[PDB]
Amino acid sequence: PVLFPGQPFGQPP
Amino acid sequence: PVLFPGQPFGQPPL
Amino acid sequence: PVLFPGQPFGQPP
Amino acid sequence: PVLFPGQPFGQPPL
Amino acid sequence: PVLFPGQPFGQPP
Amino acid sequence: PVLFPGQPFGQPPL
Amino acid sequence: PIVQNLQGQMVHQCISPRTLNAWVKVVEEKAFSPEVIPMFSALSCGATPQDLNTMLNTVGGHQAAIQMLKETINEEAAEWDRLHPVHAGPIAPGQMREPRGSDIAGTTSTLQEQIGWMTHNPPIPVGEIYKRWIILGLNKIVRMYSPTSILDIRQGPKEPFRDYVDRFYKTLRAEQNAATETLLVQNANPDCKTILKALGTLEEMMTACQ
Amino acid sequence: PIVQNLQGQMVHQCISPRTLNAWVKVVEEKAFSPEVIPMFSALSCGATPQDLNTMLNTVGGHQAAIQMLKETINEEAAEWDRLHPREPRGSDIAGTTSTLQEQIGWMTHNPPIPVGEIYKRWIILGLNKIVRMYSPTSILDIRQGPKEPFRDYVDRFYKTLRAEQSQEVKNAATETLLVQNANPDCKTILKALGPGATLEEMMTACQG
Amino acid sequence: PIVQNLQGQMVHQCISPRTLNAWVKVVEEKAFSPEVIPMFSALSCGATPQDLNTMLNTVGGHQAAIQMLKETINEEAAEWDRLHPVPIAPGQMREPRGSDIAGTTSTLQEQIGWMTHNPPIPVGEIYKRWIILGLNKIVRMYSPTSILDIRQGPKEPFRDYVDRFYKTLRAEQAATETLLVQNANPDCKTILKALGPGATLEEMMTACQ
Amino acid sequence: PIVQQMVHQCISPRTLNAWVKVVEEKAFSPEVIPMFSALSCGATPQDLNTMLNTVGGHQAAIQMLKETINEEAAEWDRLHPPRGSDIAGTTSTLQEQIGWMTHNPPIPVGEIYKRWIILGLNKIVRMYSPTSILDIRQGPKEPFRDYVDRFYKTLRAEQASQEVKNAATETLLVQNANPDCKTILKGPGATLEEMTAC
Amino acid sequence: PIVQNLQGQMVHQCISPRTLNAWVKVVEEKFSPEVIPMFSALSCGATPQDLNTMLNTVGGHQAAIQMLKETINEEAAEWDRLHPEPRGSDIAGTTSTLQEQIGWMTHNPPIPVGEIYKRWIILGLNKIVRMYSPTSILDIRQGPKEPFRDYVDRFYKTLRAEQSQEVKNAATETLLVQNANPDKTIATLEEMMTACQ
Amino acid sequence: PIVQNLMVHQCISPRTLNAWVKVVEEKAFSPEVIPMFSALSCGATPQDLNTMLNTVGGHQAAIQMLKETINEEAAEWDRLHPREPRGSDIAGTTSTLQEQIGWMTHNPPIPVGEIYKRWIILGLNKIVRMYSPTSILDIRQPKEPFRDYVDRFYKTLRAEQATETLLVQNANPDCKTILKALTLEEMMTACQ
Ligand SMILES: O=P(O)(O)O[C@H]1[C@H](OP(=O)(O)O)[C@H](OP(=O)(O)O)[C@H](OP(=O)(O)O)[C@@H](OP(=O)(O)O)[C@H]1OP(=O)(O)O
Ligand SMILES: O=P(O)(O)O[C@H]1[C@H](OP(=O)(O)O)[C@H](OP(=O)(O)O)[C@H](OP(=O)(O)O)[C@@H](OP(=O)(O)O)[C@H]1OP(=O)(O)O
């Protein structure tokens, strides 16, 4: 998952 | 009449 | 039909 | 009178 | 007083 | 304190 | 749209949010009145087929008109394909493939292809060809949405002759004018009708019924 | 319109949405008041006949004035064809028989043929006929009320005078009708100051 | 976005306040109607993956759709990594992975270089394809009524009925010609059946005025 | 207007509407004069005439402005036997006006004609001043800030000579304050910021 | 901000009235979570002088402004620790002229004091939106006949305001279905919302 | 103002003009009108500064206080600096636009626009301090939330310009006891 639940868009994982 | 009643401005006649 | 009912303008067929 | 009564501004006279 | 009461800003003396 | 209470952001100190 | 920069070259630019919202609000406020046709053409000045598709797709509601607009585009594109069947093959290096109807509508053409046709020398203004199809269908929409007929426009009991003529040519503009000079004087009030019949220009007709 | 870019070349540019809406709203709000004439002329600065047609086409309603404007354009185009029997014909100046390329060619020519300003002249002329027609009252029917302030009376005077439009009648009606139609309270004061007094002196003399 | 200036070079530019507030207000007013899809595409014209993430992050509320948009981006990005298994040549840039197109593991310098490259890698348009795809799933899910549940009201004008018809049809995304005439009032339905198949919507609506 | 090479530019729809709106809203308040001068920055006499022609209504003030332009142009023709009518934009073409302004050395006919317009607008603002400074007293529970605001706002419009303005401030301001504040103001030679919370 | 002109050079430009009013109105209308990226976007390429201007133009909310100030003090004191070259007070724009800030940002290699100072502001604003979060994610239960869409909207909106990641992922898989109405008994979020019409 | 082309003078923009007149109309002299003036007057000459203050209708009490403040700063400039711009030249009253542009574009420059803007912002800060409705000593917290009390405290402190002492001193006995036992983040979470 590049974007997980809850983080904003473009947040570095 | 270059411009006719009801017809828009800049309208190609004939 | 280039444009179908309900499909948006510029829709790839 | 450069500008006359009722005549607009920049009105060419004569 | 460079500017006086009621006189506009930038008013020449 | 780089910024003090009531003073504006960008305020030169002292 | 495609505009000429300060350097003098024809270059694409993004459709502005001011243009986007101005088109949305004009459709929201004026629906499909006659004066929405030139407002669309003005706001779509130099627009690519992609920008035109964007202006139409941003229209919420009015989906009956939108669908009639689509079917009009289908007719003009099918007519364009009837008139321009492309003799396919190795399109020349430096030249563009002949645009079919679906390419002019922006459905089967990329933005790079549309820009190439419009900026070509000699150009193929697919933007103005597709805008011609849109304006045509919109004229059918405004014609349909005209509420009253010119035959049903008679001067009210004490309605001023100015307001009557305003309602006359407004309904005459939406509908599409053979009996324009006959029906106008005929549907006036007997007070003004007798004056108009006595004269035998609209300027003269309105100064005569003040 | 046709404008000069930063690089210094005269080039066509699309009419701006700011200019389009500004013209639509000034027609919706002010209809055909006298101050709509210069607002049209200023919003149409450097406009091509195609841009002028677009502004007039964008006007919703007021189709009576639109048609009077059309017939005036017909008269001025017919007189241009009489005076000028490729040289742009009257229909070309109106933008009906000329492409945008041809119009740009005439305006950017050296020497230029400003078909934008010629066609704008015809539109302004027909709009002056519309404004003069939509003028509700006549300058002869403008009399100072019983207790109406002399400022309100002069405001209505020169507002009616401006709408009804030209110079010999306006200059004569100004010096005569204005004092002649004031109430006897202010009218005897204005005649005492006599001609040669300025409106500033006339209105300070009737501040009560 | 990446725009061409007056000198003719493709350069980055800050996303404008007019574009930001226009996107915020069009989400506040129209939520997820079918016409916010092209408005997003228009306001995100030439946008970088950083500018795309900014538009989505500025969206307050609607977090159910925001999360469904994230899970769609996860699917399309995982598919991109399955289709594109990835030192870089001195005139080239590293092959962008799914997380780099999404703007999470890529700097703005890296994104601009992929978009302005020749030949380019339009990571802005690839990431916008994933966003638009997820937004269509949202609009389809947020469609209130079905097309089968659209019938003409007792005295509802045929114009208002067709408007609601293609409005719900647009939101839900074959049987268009037959269901339209079948769900009209017996007043207009008999007229439409009389004209027969092959009639246009213009002829049908002019027949029920 | 003439903007920078110095080239002519059409007066902008934003400047037009900003001038029509500031006349519609503020009529002839004192701050309309610097709003006119700011919107006419670099304007040719033609652009100036366009701004005044776009003014609808207020024709009594427009006519007083014309008669003021006539006076100052007639005075210009007495001192300079561009003529005054060329400065006013009536007998000069746009090309002639651009030439006078773009000359080296220049003849700023735009600024000369704007100086006539500004002078006439001052006579209009002075005339349209509703109340006198000798009628701006504070009242029962009007805040002192609101009273001083109205005072210098009425002082600004009436355009008395600077000797009258200075003296009217030191004397009439404290004289017309309510006894609550009037007694607190009293030591002489105080500044307006000292004059405290009431 | 610092922007590249048509000539291709990075030059300073005054912060625009459209950007100023847009920021003031976003603060007046919404410290919501979506105000953070709206501040970052409007502050695109901004110099610390422009950032200070954007924060000074905020009327009211002085508790948040003061908590924002104290966060900047902490990050500036931490920058002075790490870096005993722009000092922390220079990045904040209090002891640095506009010329010095431009010189650091336009340097090659650059010292983006605009993005370092924006980082401190965004950090302090995240502490403010975390504090002003009204409800907890544990207090979010689906209403009686509240649609599952509206419940999920209120869930992740409360989750977004109450920002760790191991907490968010665990609260998503567990608390979301656990706090739903029993009618819960009924996978991706799209499948979950399509299953609870 | 003076802006750099692709340094040249430019007419003050109508957008800048209308935004300034509207921010003074809406927010009068709130503390946040000071940076708005500074940002709208960015790169402004003394002529453009005078124009912004002259376009302000009403508030002529503040306008006069602003003038008298400029007089003090111009008189102080003539004391420290006995063609070099005198205080009246910086205020734009005795200097032409060419003269002001020549001072601002000089190498080395004499930023008469930023020196005159300094005097304006100074007088504006005095005005905002005068227009503060309440004093900070009269700012006390029954059931008013500690958030709203701190908001009013630092808003009155920002305009007025013993912060740590008076803040806990004027809280209600509920929050005052907690604060006296103990950062503002910690102080607000302790009285939630
Ligand atoms: O808001 P802005 O950033 O100032 O940009 C636009 C526009 O340019 P862009 O839309 O391409 O950015 C022009 O300003 P510049 O940015 O080019 O300096 C200006 O028009 P002029 O060039 O004639 O001065 C005006 O025009 P518009 O909004 O109609 O596009 C303006 O927007 P605003 O004046 O509304 O702020
Ligand atoms: O606010 P915007 O998003 O920029 O759009 C415009 C615009 O801006 P302003 O409200 O700030 O003035 C117009 O002004 P200009 O940009 O042309 O200067 C204004 O109309 P005015 O010309 O009278 O100022 C008004 O237009 P409207 O009457 O429709 O509200 C407004 O709102 P719109 O976006 O709806 O056009």
Side-chain angles (χ1 to χ4, degrees), chain A residues 1-10 12-13, chain B residues 1-10 12-13, chain C, chain D residues 1-13, chain E residues 1-6 8-10 12-13, chain F residues 1-13, chain G residues 1-5 8 10-153 155-157 159-176 178-196 198 200-210, chain H residues 1-5 8-17 19-81 83-96 98-131 133-142 144-167 169 172-174 176-208, chain I residues 1-5 8-81 83-87 89-106 108-139 142-150 152-154 156-176 178-181 183-189 191-209, chain J residues 1-3 6 8-20 22-23 25-82 84-101 103 105-134 136-140 142-171 173-185 187-195 197-198, chain K residues 1-5 8 10-84 86-95 97-140 142-145 147-165 167-172 174-180 182-183 185-197, chain L residues 1-3 5 7-14 16-29 31-79 81-97 99-128 130-138 140-142 145-159 161-163 165-167 169-174 176 178 180-181 184-185 187-191:
Chain A
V2 171
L3 295 172
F4 300 100
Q7 46 202 105
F9 298 85
Chain B
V2 294
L3 290 168
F4 304 90
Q7 304 199 37
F9 298 90
Chain C
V2 174
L3 295 170
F4 297 99
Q7 303 297 313
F9 297 91
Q11 165 79 39
Chain D
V2 171
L3 290 166
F4 304 92
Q7 303 298 309
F9 298 87
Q11 167 77 37
Chain E
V2 175
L3 294 168
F4 296 99
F9 296 88
Chain F
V2 177
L3 294 167
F4 295 98
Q7 297 201 321
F9 298 94
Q11 167 76 42
Chain G
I2 298 186
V3 302
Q4 179 171 327
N5 59 1
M10 231 60 58
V11 53
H12 177 257
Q13 68 173 24
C14 292
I15 182 171
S16 69
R18 185 176 234 114
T19 301
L20 290 168
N21 189 254
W23 171 237
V24 174
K25 296 298 174 177
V26 162
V27 177
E28 285 176 359
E29 296 174 1
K30 295 298 188 62
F32 290 93
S33 306
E35 72 279 7
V36 191
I37 313 300
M39 191 63 108
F40 173 81
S41 181
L43 294 176
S44 64
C45 177
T48 65
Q50 180 195 66
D51 300 313
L52 295 172
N53 291 330
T54 300
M55 296 179 65
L56 306 182
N57 289 316
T58 47
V59 174
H62 304 278
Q63 298 306 131
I66 291 291
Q67 183 62 23
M68 281 186 299
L69 188 61
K70 295 177 180 179
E71 299 177 354
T72 310
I73 292 172
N74 293 8
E75 294 173 342
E76 303 301 315
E79 176 69 10
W80 179 274
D81 293 341
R82 196 187 72 87
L83 304 173
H84 304 70
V86 298
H87 292 67
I91 60 137
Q95 307 289 352
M96 292 279 300
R97 58 176 193 86
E98 285 175 301
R100 301 154 303 181
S102 54
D103 301 312
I104 299 183
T107 59
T108 60
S109 66
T110 75
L111 179 59
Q112 272 67 18
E113 298 175 1
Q114 303 170 5
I115 293 169
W117 284 312
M118 299 166 68
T119 59
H120 203 291
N121 216 26
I124 302 298
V126 293
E128 307 305 308
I129 301 173
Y130 185 44
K131 189 198 301 182
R132 184 192 314 127
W133 303 346
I134 300 171
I135 292 178
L136 182 67
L138 292 177
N139 284 316
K140 304 201 302 181
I141 295 160
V142 172
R143 218 178 310 144
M144 281 209 46
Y145 285 11
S146 67
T148 54
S149 176
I150 191 69
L151 296 165
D152 300 312
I153 296 298
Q155 188 178 3
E159 183 193 7
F161 184 62
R162 178 163 68 189
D163 303 1
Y164 160 67
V165 176
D166 284 317
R167 300 185 308 112
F168 187 94
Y169 289 98
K170 176 181 181 179
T171 55
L172 184 78
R173 179 186 183 183
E175 286 196 326
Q176 59 210 259
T180 172
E181 300 299 317
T182 301
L183 203 153
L184 181 67
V185 297
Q186 197 283 331
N187 283 77
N189 287 326
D191 304 326
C192 180
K193 181 187 316 195
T194 51
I195 303 176
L196 303 176
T201 75
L202 186 61
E203 179 184 43
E204 301 159 354
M205 281 190 282
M206 293 183 60
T207 37
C209 291
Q210 168 82 332
Chain H
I2 301 186
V3 299
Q4 175 197 166
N5 58 1
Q9 292 85 46
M10 295 298 301
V11 59
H12 176 258
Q13 284 200 314
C14 293
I15 186 65
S16 66
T19 306
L20 293 167
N21 182 70
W23 170 240
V24 175
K25 293 295 166 53
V26 77
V27 175
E28 290 175 353
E29 294 176 1
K30 292 173 174 295
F32 290 92
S33 308
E35 73 277 7
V36 192
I37 313 302
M39 187 66 103
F40 173 80
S41 178
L43 294 175
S44 62
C45 184
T48 64
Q50 180 194 66
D51 300 312
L52 294 170
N53 290 332
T54 302
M55 296 181 186
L56 307 181
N57 290 318
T58 326
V59 173
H62 303 283
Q63 298 304 130
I66 292 290
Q67 183 62 21
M68 280 186 296
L69 187 61
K70 293 178 179 180
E71 299 175 351
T72 303
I73 292 171
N74 296 7
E75 293 175 341
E76 302 303 313
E79 187 165 14
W80 178 273
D81 295 339
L83 269 50
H84 304 68
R86 179 179 54 83
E87 279 220 55
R89 309 312 302 254
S91 56
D92 302 314
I93 299 181
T96 59
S98 64
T99 75
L100 180 60
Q101 165 195 4
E102 299 174 2
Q103 302 169 3
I104 292 170
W106 283 311
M107 297 168 69
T108 59
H109 203 323
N110 271 2
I113 304 180
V115 292
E117 307 305 308
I118 302 171
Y119 184 42
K120 189 197 302 180
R121 186 210 308 127
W122 303 346
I123 301 173
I124 293 294
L125 182 68
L127 290 176
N128 286 313
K129 302 178 178 180
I130 296 158
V131 171
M133 176 157 314
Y134 287 13
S135 179
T137 53
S138 173
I139 191 67
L140 297 169
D141 299 314
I142 297 297
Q144 187 178 3
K147 58 170 186 173
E148 183 195 9
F150 185 61
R151 183 203 296 189
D152 300 0
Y153 160 65
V154 173
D155 283 315
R156 302 186 306 111
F157 187 96
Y158 289 78
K159 180 177 182 177
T160 308
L161 183 77
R162 179 183 183 184
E164 283 205 319
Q165 324 197 357
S166 290
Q167 207 287 114
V169 283
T174 285
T176 58
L177 270 297
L178 182 64
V179 175
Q180 183 178 326
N181 285 86
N183 46 29
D185 299 327
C186 179
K187 176 172 181 171
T188 188
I189 303 179
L190 302 176
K191 299 229 64 180
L193 310 184
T198 73
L199 183 63
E200 181 179 5
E201 298 162 353
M202 292 170 61
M203 283 200 287
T204 51
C206 290
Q207 54 180 7
Chain I
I2 308 295
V3 300
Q4 180 168 331
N5 59 0
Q9 307 295 303
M10 294 294 305
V11 295
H12 180 254
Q13 199 169 105
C14 288
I15 181 170
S16 67
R18 178 167 277 249
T19 301
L20 290 165
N21 192 249
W23 170 242
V24 170
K25 294 299 175 177
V26 76
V27 176
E28 289 173 358
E29 293 177 1
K30 297 175 179 176
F32 290 92
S33 305
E35 74 280 3
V36 289
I37 314 300
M39 187 64 95
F40 174 79
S41 180
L43 295 173
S44 66
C45 170
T48 63
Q50 177 197 64
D51 300 313
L52 294 172
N53 290 328
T54 299
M55 293 179 67
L56 305 183
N57 288 322
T58 45
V59 175
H62 301 281
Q63 298 304 126
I66 265 61
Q67 291 303 134
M68 282 171 50
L69 187 62
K70 293 175 182 177
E71 299 176 354
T72 299
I73 292 171
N74 293 5
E75 295 172 346
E76 303 300 314
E79 176 71 7
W80 178 272
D81 292 349
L83 299 171
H84 301 71
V86 184
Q92 308 286 356
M93 308 213 82
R94 54 179 196 85
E95 293 148 302
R97 301 154 306 184
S99 57
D100 301 313
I101 298 182
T104 56
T105 61
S106 66
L108 178 60
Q109 172 184 16
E110 302 178 358
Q111 302 171 2
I112 293 171
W114 282 312
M115 298 168 69
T116 60
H117 203 290
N118 254 311
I121 305 179
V123 293
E125 308 304 311
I126 303 173
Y127 185 43
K128 191 198 302 182
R129 186 209 309 127
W130 303 347
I131 298 173
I132 290 179
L133 191 148
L135 293 177
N136 287 315
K137 303 165 60 178
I138 294 159
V139 170
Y142 284 21
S143 182
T145 54
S146 313
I147 191 65
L148 298 172
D149 300 313
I150 295 301
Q152 188 176 3
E156 184 192 10
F158 185 62
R159 180 207 296 191
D160 303 2
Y161 160 66
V162 176
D163 284 315
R164 300 186 305 112
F165 187 94
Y166 289 98
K167 172 185 179 180
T168 53
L169 182 76
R170 178 185 183 183
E172 281 206 314
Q173 305 167 64
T176 57
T178 52
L179 189 71
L180 182 62
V181 295
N183 287 336
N185 288 326
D187 305 326
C188 178
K189 176 185 182 186
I191 300 296
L192 302 176
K193 283 180 162 297
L195 303 186
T200 71
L201 185 61
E202 177 188 2
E203 300 160 354
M204 291 171 54
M205 289 183 59
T206 46
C208 292
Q209 289 189 10
Chain J
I2 309 295
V3 300
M6 299 298 300
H8 178 255
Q9 184 190 334
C10 289
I11 184 65
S12 71
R14 314 221 200 280
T15 304
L16 296 161
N17 181 70
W19 169 241
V20 171
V22 75
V23 177
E25 294 176 354
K26 301 294 190 62
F28 287 92
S29 306
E31 74 278 6
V32 188
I33 298 186
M35 193 61 192
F36 172 78
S37 178
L39 295 171
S40 68
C41 177
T44 64
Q46 179 196 66
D47 300 311
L48 296 172
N49 290 327
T50 303
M51 293 177 68
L52 306 181
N53 286 321
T54 46
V55 174
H58 305 278
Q59 299 304 127
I62 282 189
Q63 181 61 24
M64 280 191 301
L65 185 60
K66 294 171 178 172
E67 299 177 351
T68 301
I69 292 174
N70 292 1
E71 295 173 359
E72 301 304 316
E75 177 70 9
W76 178 275
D77 297 340
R78 185 186 73 86
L79 302 172
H80 305 67
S85 59
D86 300 313
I87 297 182
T90 61
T91 61
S92 63
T93 75
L94 177 59
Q95 298 296 322
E96 296 177 5
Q97 302 168 3
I98 292 171
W100 280 311
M101 301 166 70
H103 203 291
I107 305 179
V109 293
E111 309 305 313
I112 305 171
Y113 185 43
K114 190 197 305 184
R115 180 161 61 248
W116 302 343
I117 301 170
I118 293 295
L119 170 60
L121 296 178
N122 282 302
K123 302 175 179 178
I124 296 162
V125 171
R126 181 223 170 273
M127 181 155 308
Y128 286 14
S129 180
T131 55
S132 294
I133 194 70
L134 318 96
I136 305 288
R137 295 96 194 283
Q138 181 163 4
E142 189 197 8
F144 186 63
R145 178 210 300 175
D146 302 357
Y147 158 66
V148 183
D149 284 320
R150 299 186 306 113
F151 187 87
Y152 286 89
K153 164 185 164 71
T154 307
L155 186 79
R156 176 185 185 181
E158 286 211 307
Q159 292 182 0
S161 86
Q162 207 47 64
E163 309 81 44
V164 181
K165 289 181 171 178
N166 304 344
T169 52
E170 318 291 72
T171 58
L173 180 64
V174 59
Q175 189 75 235
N176 289 334
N178 49 25
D180 300 329
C181 177
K182 179 172 182 173
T183 190
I184 301 176
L185 305 177
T191 177
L192 188 56
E193 71 171 15
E194 283 165 351
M195 290 174 178
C198 161
Chain K
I2 309 297
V3 59
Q4 180 169 334
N5 58 2
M10 294 297 301
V11 296
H12 176 257
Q13 286 193 0
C14 305
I15 187 65
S16 69
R18 180 145 284 163
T19 307
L20 292 165
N21 289 312
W23 171 238
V24 173
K25 295 297 160 52
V26 162
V27 178
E28 287 175 1
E29 294 173 1
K30 304 162 177 293
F31 297 96
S32 310
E34 73 278 7
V35 191
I36 313 301
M38 184 67 95
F39 174 80
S40 178
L42 293 174
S43 59
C44 174
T47 189
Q49 180 191 64
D50 293 323
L51 294 171
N52 291 327
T53 303
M54 294 177 63
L55 306 184
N56 289 317
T57 46
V58 174
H61 305 96
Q62 296 306 129
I65 282 191
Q66 182 62 23
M67 287 186 298
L68 187 63
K69 293 178 177 181
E70 299 176 352
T71 304
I72 290 172
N73 293 6
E74 295 175 357
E75 304 300 311
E78 169 70 348
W79 180 273
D80 300 343
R81 261 187 73 265
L82 220 72
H83 305 274
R87 304 201 51 52
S89 197
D90 303 310
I91 300 181
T94 56
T95 57
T97 77
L98 180 59
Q99 301 81 350
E100 299 174 1
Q101 302 172 5
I102 292 170
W104 282 312
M105 300 168 71
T106 200
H107 203 291
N108 212 314
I111 302 296
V113 295
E115 305 306 307
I116 303 172
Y117 185 42
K118 189 197 304 177
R119 228 183 309 276
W120 305 344
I121 301 171
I122 292 293
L123 182 69
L125 293 177
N126 285 316
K127 302 175 179 177
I128 294 158
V129 300
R130 226 183 300 233
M131 175 156 312
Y132 282 21
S133 179
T135 322
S136 173
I137 190 68
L138 295 171
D139 301 312
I140 296 297
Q142 184 174 7
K145 193 34 190 174
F148 185 61
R149 180 209 299 190
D150 303 358
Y151 159 64
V152 174
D153 282 309
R154 294 181 357 258
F155 188 94
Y156 290 101
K157 176 169 174 288
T158 307
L159 185 74
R160 179 184 184 181
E162 283 195 336
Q163 297 155 3
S164 295
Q165 277 285 263
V167 185
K168 293 182 176 179
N169 307 343
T172 285
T174 55
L175 298 177
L176 182 65
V177 179
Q178 189 271 314
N179 285 332
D183 224 358
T185 51
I186 298 177
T188 72
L189 184 61
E190 183 196 20
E191 299 163 355
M192 290 170 61
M193 292 181 57
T194 317
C196 293
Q197 307 81 1
Chain L
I2 309 292
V3 299
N5 57 4
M7 271 315 158
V8 58
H9 179 254
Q10 205 173 33
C11 286
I12 181 170
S13 178
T16 302
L17 291 167
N18 178 68
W20 171 237
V21 71
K22 291 296 177 178
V23 167
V24 177
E25 279 169 5
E26 292 174 357
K27 295 170 173 296
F29 290 93
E32 74 279 4
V33 82
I34 315 299
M36 189 67 86
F37 173 81
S38 181
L40 294 175
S41 63
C42 166
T45 65
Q47 181 193 63
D48 300 313
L49 293 172
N50 291 331
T51 301
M52 294 179 67
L53 308 180
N54 288 314
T55 49
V56 173
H59 302 282
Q60 299 299 136
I63 291 294
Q64 184 57 29
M65 272 184 47
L66 190 60
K67 294 177 180 181
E68 299 178 348
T69 302
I70 290 174
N71 294 359
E72 296 172 342
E73 303 303 314
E76 177 70 11
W77 179 274
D78 293 339
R79 194 280 291 299
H81 303 67
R83 189 227 311 277
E84 172 96 0
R86 296 183 72 255
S88 57
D89 300 313
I90 298 182
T93 59
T94 59
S95 63
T96 75
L97 179 59
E99 295 177 6
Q100 303 169 4
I101 290 171
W103 281 312
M104 300 168 69
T105 200
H106 203 320
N107 215 37
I110 302 298
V112 294
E114 306 305 309
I115 303 173
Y116 185 42
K117 191 197 302 180
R118 187 208 307 128
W119 305 346
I120 299 172
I121 293 179
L122 183 67
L124 291 180
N125 286 313
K126 300 178 178 179
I127 292 157
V128 172
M130 303 290 307
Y131 285 14
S132 180
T134 55
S135 177
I136 190 174
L137 296 83
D138 301 55
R140 282 166 275 280
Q141 186 174 7
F146 184 65
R147 176 207 291 190
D148 304 0
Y149 161 67
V150 170
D151 284 312
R152 298 182 354 257
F153 185 86
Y154 286 98
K155 184 179 184 60
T156 310
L157 171 73
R158 176 177 179 177
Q161 52 81 57
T163 54
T165 300
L166 192 72
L167 180 62
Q169 173 154 20
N170 285 340
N172 48 27
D174 317 322
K176 171 173 171 54
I178 302 174
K180 199 72 193 68
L184 184 67
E185 177 178 34
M187 292 174 62
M188 291 182 61
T189 43
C191 303

